[PDB]
């Protein structure tokens, strides 16, 4: 009956024009994206005509702001539905995110994940085509506290911001380790400095056999360990909107931004896996993840795919022309710096950060085919971002050649093996997931 | 030659009209304030006509927003120079603080501590009278990270915000306590989750014999202890502007907001004392502190006074008509709440928070007399905020009657005794500091 194709991708950190080069492998990527019914990416950059003020985002790597003309590069390349909840959408504050919504709506680009209040950030966006409709929901587990949007009260408006997926981490420690922690709390004088809060609240907010010291949760356990768990409010609220989107579109896609690592850098946080299973339990047809800037595994759960990380589809951080004063201060200089010189110094003249490692310059574009909601095909198109090229050329995407596509498909297979995922490989280096249907 | 009088006060948390009642003791307070050359207070509330969006400030006790008409109550009561750097000036975000600056300038009220960028927040404001001039600088050590203002770069504007006095706390632990902390770091799996940051930065950001675990600084020492120290950039920058103000006014007053407790709730943070000494070293004639909502000691340093905390001069938190949705969520309710009901539930129907304790409803208004920069008199006027009165009446200030003024003057003397400060007491309950001049 209804047959729809969806292209997925990761972080779109675009800061310059000419996104699709004259390379035939790059033009074939645009042809691939244009040929689908819907093409989703995560706008990991603030398009701006000047509205707002830079926030201090040292932990996110600095501000990521670009001329709003980059939005024409995104649409001309083939992307048609935008997820905006990430740790950079608020780089220009509440006024910046209101400016982003204005820019996207004036260009007729559907988006989700940000809004003038919390409900607007949580809502799905519905993209309608002659062949059918797709609902996109977008959330992020990585952001500066306070950047989440807020809903209005009877007396005050809401707050523009992002759709949050909060989570808590608990340290499991032995009883003897717990006793030393409380000993350190008492003997340093730290417990004495909570005496006022004890009188005002009536309780010591550090005794919960839980315990909250140094802004971290500790719990007595038989063996040391580390746990993560999604905020119940965010999980139930996002799931609520997923069930709503299921009634009003053929396909529901949940895009989640998450930098958080599991026990290993390539594994997702345990909470993120619980989140993705819940989204499919509620009716989502796919979960697309991003954040780490490298690829993570792919899981098939109840015959629906979870892409824990598609990495970067566009990577032009080092080419941004808008560096904030607080960002400049992170580099000690004997003379005022130009942006390119600042990024060269920040990376130690290229010897650290993302440039030296190949994992940050390989990507993947899945193309999913659905027939009345059933996944019938999941093609995998490896993407090359130009590792080792000059800074002004690396970061633009093109379909990887045969040899490098095969290495990328091998990585994906190895990263997805713990989930029982198998891949068929074509002669050109592209592949597809082995499905049970 | 030049003789000037300065009235000082603490937190002005005004949310209603009729600030000065028909009580003769309240009208005499207005007469006292009006009779000085300059009257300084800390505007601990966002006056607003609607511009901005509420930020999440749970740690500050919620949002503190009021009708801008309260500014007429502040000036009619006698206050004439306003310090605005505190942990509530950003309760409506960057747009709110820009709206506050607009409101203050349209009413011709001199202010300092906030600005459209960092320099503007650091600048002194110069209040000129026929008898002479006073320079006010205002900073805060308590605020949500990111709320500090930012200066512009060649490519991006600054960020509106407050004048910050940042500080770091270090836990001194024994070597055996340090070994258990690193053991907990390794055995829980926490050290494993920094593996990516180790590759990107080239170092483990937790090994500094310093150490940074759980977002807290640890240092090996012979005995456990607790240290605090001002951020060197903020200390040098604020001191720089103090020396500038010294050249352009008779009197330089530094107002610093600080909730941070010392070893005991009544003692200031060690960093705050270093800050106050530095301000007078640089040429300030007085340092007025606030934040804790109760009184702290008074110190005479190089014949200049340091008031570590003057408490509240106006306390009408529970009467605010603008409660944000995130604030409402902190109280579990079976029905939507009105503001007054919300505050009643938040305080456990009056059995906790500030209402049960008398220290939160006594205040002090010092009146300093300077002659060519030399302190010649420091009168102390105890102020009563109506402990035990109904919520709609407590928080308005009046000169305390004889009996309660004497008890307040005794508290101040006891809180100032560790600094060697002596007080003379008048028959009406007012007093003055014993000076060496």
């Amino acid at each position: 009956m209804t047959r729809l194709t969806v292209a997925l991708s990761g972080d779109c950190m675009v800061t310059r024009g000419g996104l699709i080069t004259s390379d035939p492998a790059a033009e074939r990527l645009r042809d691939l994206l244009r040929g689908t019914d819907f093409a989703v990416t995560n706008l990991e950059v603030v398009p701006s005509d000047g509205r707002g003020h830079p926030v201090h985002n040292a932990v996110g790597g600095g501000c990521l702001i670009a001329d709003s003309a980059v939005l024409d590069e995104v649409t001309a390349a083939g992307f048609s539905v935008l997820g905006c909840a990430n740790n950079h959408a608020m780089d220009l504050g509440t006024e910046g995110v209101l400016g982003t919504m204005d820019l996207l709506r004036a260009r007729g680009i559907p988006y989700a994940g940000i809004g003038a209040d919390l409900t607007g950030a949580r809502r799905p966006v519905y993209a309608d085509r002659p062949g059918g409709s797709l609902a996109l929901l977008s959330c992020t587990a990585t952001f500066l506290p306070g950047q989440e949007a807020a809903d209005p009260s009877p007396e005050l408006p809401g707050r523009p911001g992002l759709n949050p997926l909060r989570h808590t981490a608990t340290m499991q420690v032995t009883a003897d380790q717990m006793d030393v922690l409380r000993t350190i709390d008492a003997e340093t004088g730290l417990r004495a400095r909570r005496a006022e809060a004890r009188a005002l609240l009536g309780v010591d907010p550090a005794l919960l056999d839980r315990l909250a010291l140094f802004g971290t949760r500790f719990r007595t356990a038989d063996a040391p360990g580390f746990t993560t768990e999604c905020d119940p409010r965010d999980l139930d609220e996002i799931a609520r909107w997923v069930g709503e989107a299921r009634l009003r579109a053929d396909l529901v896609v949940v895009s989640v931004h998450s930098h958080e690592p599991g026990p290993t850098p390539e594994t997702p946080g345990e909470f993120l896996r619980v989140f993705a299973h819940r989204m499919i339990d509620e009716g989502a047809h796919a979960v697309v993840g991003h954040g780490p800037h490298f690829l993570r595994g792919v899981e098939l759960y109840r015959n629906k795919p979870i892409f824990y990380s598609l990495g970067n589809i566009v990577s032009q951080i080092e080419l941004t022309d808008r560096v904030s004063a607080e960002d400049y201060a992170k580099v000690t200089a004997e003379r005022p710096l130009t942006p390119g010189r600042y990024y060269d110094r920040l990376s130690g003249h290229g010897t650290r950060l993302f440039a030296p490692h190949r994992r940050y310059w390989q990507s993947l574009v899945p193309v999913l085919t659905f027939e009345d909601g059933t996944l019938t095909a999941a093609r995998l198109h490896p993407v090359d971002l130009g590792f080792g090229r000059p800074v002004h050329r690396r970061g633009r995407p093109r379909l990887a050649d045969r040899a490098e596509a095969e290495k990328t498909l091998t990585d994906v297979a190895q990263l997805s093996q713990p989930y029982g995922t198998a891949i068929e490989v074509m002669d050109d280096g592209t592949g597809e997931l082995a499905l049970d249907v | 030659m030049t003789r000037l009088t300065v009235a000082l006060s603490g937190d002005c948390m005004v949310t209603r009209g009729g600030l000065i009642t028909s009580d003769p003791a309240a009208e005499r307070l207005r007469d006292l304030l009006r009779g000085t050359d300059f009257a300084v207070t800390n505007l601990e509330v966002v006056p607003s006509d609607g511009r901005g969006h509420p930020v999440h400030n749970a740690v500050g006790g919620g949002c503190l927003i009021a009708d801008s008409a309260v500014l007429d109550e502040v000036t009619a009561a006698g206050f004439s120079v306003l310090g605005c750097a505190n942990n509530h000036a950003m309760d409506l975000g960057t747009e709110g603080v820009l709206g506050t600056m607009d409101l203050l300038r349209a009413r011709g009220i001199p202010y300092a501590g906030i600005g459209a960028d960092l320099t503007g927040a650091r600048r002194p404001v110069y209040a000129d009278r026929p008898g002479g001039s006073l320079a006010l600088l205002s900073c805060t050590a308590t605020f949500l990270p990111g709320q500090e203002a930012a200066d512009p770069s060649p490519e991006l504007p600054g960020r509106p915000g407050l004048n910050p006095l940042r500080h770091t706390a270090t836990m001194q632990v024994t070597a055996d306590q340090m070994d258990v902390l690193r053991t907990i770091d390794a055995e829980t799996g926490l050290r494993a989750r920094r593996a990516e940051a180790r590759a990107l930065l080239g170092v483990d950001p937790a090994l500094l014999d310093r150490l940074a675990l759980f977002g807290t600084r640890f240092r090996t020492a012979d005995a456990p202890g607790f240290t605090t120290e001002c951020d060197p950039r903020d200390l040098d920058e604020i001191a720089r502007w103090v020396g500038e103000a010294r050249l352009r006014a008779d009197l330089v007053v530094v107002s610093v907001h600080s909730h941070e407790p010392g070893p005991t709730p009544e003692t200031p943070g060690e960093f705050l004392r270093v800050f106050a000494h530095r301000m007078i070293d640089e040429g300030a004639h007085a340092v007025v502190g606030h934040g804790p909502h109760f009184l702290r000691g008074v110190e005479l340093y190089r014949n200049k006074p340091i008031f570590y905390s003057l408490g509240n001069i106006v306390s009408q938190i529970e009467l605010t008509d603008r409660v944000s949705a995130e604030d409402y969520a902190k109280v579990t309710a079976e029905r939507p709440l009105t503001p007054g009901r919300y505050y009643d539930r938040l305080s456990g129907h009056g059995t906790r928070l500030f209402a049960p304790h008398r220290r939160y409803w006594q205040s002090l208004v010092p009146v300093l007399t300077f002659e060519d920069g030399t302190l010649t008199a420091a009168r102390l006027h105890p102020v009563d905020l109506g402990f035990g009165r109904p919520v709609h009446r407590r928080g308005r200030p009046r000169l305390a009657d004889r009996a309660e003024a004497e008890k307040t003057l005794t508290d101040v003397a006891q809180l100032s005794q560790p600094y060697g400060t002596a007080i003379e007491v008048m028959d009406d309950g007012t007093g003055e500091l014993a000076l060496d001049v």
Binding site: V59, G60, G61, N87, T142, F143, L144, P145, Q147, A169, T216, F226, H259, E260, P261, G291, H293, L353, F354 | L190, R193, R194, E196, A197, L200, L201, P205, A206, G215
Partner: peptide, 9 residues
């Protein structure tokens, strides 16, 4: 806002 990973560049 990047508690245990420290870096989320």
């Amino acid at each position: 806002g990047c508690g245990y990973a420290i870096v989320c560049f």
